[PDB]
Ligand binder design. Structure first.
Ligand SMILES: Cc1c(C(=O)NS(=O)(=O)C2CC2)cc(-c2ccc(Cl)c(Oc3ccccn3)c2)c2cc[nH]c12
Ligand SMILES: Nc1ncnc2c1ncn2[C@@H]1O[C@H](COP(=O)(O)OP(=O)(O)O)[C@@H](O)[C@H]1O
Ligand SMILES: O=C(O)[C@@H]1CCCC[C@H]1C(=O)O
Ligand SMILES: [Mg+2]
Ligand SMILES: [Mg+2]
Length: 260
């Protein structure tokens, strides 16, 4: 509907982005509360990621799922690009993890189910998210998980190169061809991080994390249950073909026993 910045009242920042900031905003006519993801043209140009910004917009604007953050539209002016997003009022899963330290098995299994459903819908459109991480997982008014930040989203298969490597699978880390299986690896990383409080390949340096991912070198603390170990171990397979389908994740006995 060719919006312009004059149509919105701007509130506090909601979060910092790589190419700008996200602000709380209210559309003047309807009083609709939303989030405005503001990006600087000069920064996007310098990075040469314009084309990828259009992909974020095109991919996310066509997705309709209760566990996927909505993108209502976008517009731009002389210096900025504005993405009109659904406001997630309970913030990030990242912040929830920082304050709780770790999630219990029931909260974890529920989040994994919500993610697996959203990803099943994405993959059915051959959409690869590729940036599944707690800061990109938002919470709706009922505490339901919403996949956000389609910034690095692509259509499968892809041989396209892109923060930390913590959530990236070996094939992406090595600049090789990849498909929807990249999001299955990220799901395994998230399951571990939710239960343990940190991702399994976390390290001080990018170099050390790269080596850990390449080797699939990780251990579980003693408190991690057999069922949780089984699902994570199945997801974190160096070989993308060996990673289970999302149908298998949703039907996993540990998921069905602790969700939702
Ligand atoms: C320098 C510049 C422009 C720019 O000034 N164009 S223009 O004013 O000449 C216009 C007639 C085309 C546009 C964009 C740009 C890129 C992606 C998206 Cl998604 C974008 O939002 C929109 C918004 C509405 C329609 C289309 N896209 C804008 C970028 C990115 C980095 N530098 C840019
Ligand atoms: N719709 C939203 N509602 C609430 N907070 C949001 C929303 N979108 C983004 N944020 C906050 O802003 C941060 C940056 O947004 P994001 O889309 O992930 O940008 P980037 O691509 O730069 O990582 C998020 O991690 C979150 O803290
Ligand atoms: O929305 C963005 O800030 C960016 C658009 C260009 C590709 C990378 C992307 C991101 O970091 O999510
Ligand atoms: Mg983000
Ligand atoms: Mg992003």
């Amino acid at each position: 509907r060719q919006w312009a910045l004059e149509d919105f009242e701007i509130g506090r920042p909601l979060g910092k982005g790589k190419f700008g900031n996200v602000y709380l905003a209210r559309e003047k006519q309807s009083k609709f509360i939303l989030a405005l993801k503001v990006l600087f043209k000069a920064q996007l140009e310098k990075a040469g990621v314009e084309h990828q910004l259009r992909r974020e917009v095109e991919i996310q604007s066509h997705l309709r799922h209760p566990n996927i953050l909505r993108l209502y539209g976008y517009f731009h002016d002389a210096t900025r690009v504005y993405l009109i997003l659904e406001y997630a009022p309970l913030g990030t899963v990242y912040r929830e993890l920082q304050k709780l330290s770790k999630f219990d098995e029931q909260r974890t299994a529920t989040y994994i189910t919500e993610l697996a459903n959203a990803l099943s819908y994405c993959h059915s459109k051959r959409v690869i998210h590729r940036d599944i991480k707690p800061e990109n997982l938002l919470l709706g008014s009922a505490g339901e998980l919403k996949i956000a930040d389609f910034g690095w989203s692509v259509h499968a298969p892809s041989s396209r190169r892109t923060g930390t490597l913590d959530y990236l699978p070996p094939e992406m880390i090595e600049g090789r061809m990849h498909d929807e299986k990249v999001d299955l690896w990220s799901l395994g990383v998230l399951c571990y991080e939710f239960l343990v409080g940190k991702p399994p390949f976390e390290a001080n340096t990018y170099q050390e994390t790269y080596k850990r991912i390449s080797r699939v070198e990780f251990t579980f603390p003693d408190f991690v249950t057999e069922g949780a170990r089984d699902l994570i171990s199945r997801l974190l397979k160096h070989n993308p073909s060996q990673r289970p389908m999302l149908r298998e994740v949703l039907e996993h006995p540990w998921i069905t026993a602790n969700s939702s």
